[PDB]
Recover the amino acids of this structure.
């Protein structure tokens, strides 16, 4: 309503390991944010990219995580 942008441009991911009761691995949990973290690190390194580590970190943290 008024000027509007009903398009955008972003990624189209899908969910992880979950219909179950097992533990998870911090290399493997939130694997969509993990992908995005490690791609930021392929582009520079993690030092340039902690806003990517933090969004991923806190994602894992929900799952009862030592992060
Ligand atoms: Cu892993």
């Amino acid at each position: 309503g008024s000027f509007t942008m009903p398009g955008l441009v972003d990624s189209n991911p899908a969910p992880p390991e979950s219909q179950e009761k097992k533990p998870l691995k911090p290399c493997c949990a939130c694997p969509e944010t993990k992908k995005a973290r490690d791609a930021c690190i392929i582009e520079k390194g993690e030092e340039h990219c902690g806003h990517l580590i933090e969004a991923h970190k806190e994602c894992m943290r929900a799952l009862g995580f030592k992060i």
